[PDB]
Design a protein around this nucleic acid. Structure first.
Length: 97
DNA sequence: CAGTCGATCGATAAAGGGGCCCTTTCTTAGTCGATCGAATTAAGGGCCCTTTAGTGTAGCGCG
């Protein structure tokens, strides 16, 4: 990832492995909260071409799950990891979202 | 070969979704804001509390 293992504790290394865990298990849900500047969102954006960082969180249901107008699947059918940044403000216009 | 394609390129009404108004309640406090309670202020004002005069009695000047 670009991290120095010798400068990190074993527990922090295991937390970093738990960061990669979503990439390796099908349909793996996980939530992480931390102080700003702890490098949470680095891996989901820069360290893999198989993950997406849906910024803001205000992404629509048709975009994310399924758009009947085009009958084409949303994000979850395409990327192996979908990471919602700034979970505080994430909101769906449609109530069923 | 010239007849005459089946893909193409125009429309002109659909359900879904984006969006962006947008208005519209809907609160949310900012300032009323005139009211009303209660609590000051006083000024008034009715009112209870003192002196005087006139009646029955003991001392004392006196014809």
């Amino acid at each position: 990832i670009g991290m120095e293992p010798a400068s990190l504790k074993e527990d922090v290394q295991w937390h970093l492995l738990a960061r990669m865990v979503p990439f390796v298990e099908n349909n793996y849900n996980v939530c992480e909260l931390g102080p700003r500047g702890t490098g949470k969102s680095h891996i989901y954006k820069e360290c893999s071409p198989n993950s997406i960082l849906v910024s803001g969180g205000q992404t629509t249901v048709a975009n994310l799950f399924y758009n009947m107008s085009s009958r084409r699947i949303g994000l979850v059918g395409l990327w192996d990891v979908v990471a919602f940044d700034q979970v505080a403000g994430i909101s769906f216009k449609d109530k069923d979202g």
